[PDB]
Design a protein around this ligand. Structure first.
Ligand SMILES: Cc1c(C)c2c3c4c1OP(=O)(O)Oc1c(C)c(C)c5c(c1C4)Cc1c(c(c(C)c(C)c1OP(=O)(O)O5)OP(=O)(O)O2)C3
Length: 129
């Protein structure tokens, strides 16, 4: 599913991402734009043989099992295909676990380099949430 910006913001709010671990909603919308262009079916393969899955591009080495990644730990205890559904529940629950893992949202390089420190609440303006 390709979300619209405001549609995704509304969904992420419903799933309790607003100020989760202190990160206002715009952070999560910004991250999804630069990670996946709002596409839940996005996949990208990395050099270490892992793959990133879904709207927040969660990686298969540590977080989900995709049946082909060496060193797989499956910390969210999900198959990575669950991260591609039009229902973002699985991506949200796994992201909540990732952001609580010690580094906050710095785990997402695209968020670190293109979102962190910017006017992230601009990502939810015009969406009457
Ligand atoms: C904190 C921690 C936990 C909770 C572990 C393990 C390790 C671990 O310490 P860590 O500092 O990561 O050191 C390791 C490093 C750097 C590598 C490269 C390892 C392993 C470990 C050891 C072995 C290992 C372990 C696993 C699982 C599922 C795999 C696949 C696995 O092989 P793999 O990832 O290729 O090789 O079991 P599990 O995650 O339950 O337990 C064992």
């Amino acid at each position: 599913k390709v979300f619209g910006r405001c549609e995704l913001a509304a969904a992420m709010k419903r799933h309790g991402l607003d100020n989760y671990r202190g990160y206002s909603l715009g952070n999560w919308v910004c991250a999804a734009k630069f990670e996946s262009n709002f596409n839940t079916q996005a996949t990208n393969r990395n050099t270490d043989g892992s793959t990133d899955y879904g709207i927040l591009q969660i990686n298969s080495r540590w977080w989900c099992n995709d049946g082909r990644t060496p060193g797989s730990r499956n910390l969210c205890n999900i198959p990575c295909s669950a991260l591609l559904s039009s229902d973002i529940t699985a991506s949200v629950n796994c992201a909540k676990k990732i952001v609580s893992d010690g580094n906050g949202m710095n785990a997402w390089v695209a968020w670190r380099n293109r979102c962190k420190g910017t006017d992230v609440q601009a990502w939810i303006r015009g969406c009457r949430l």
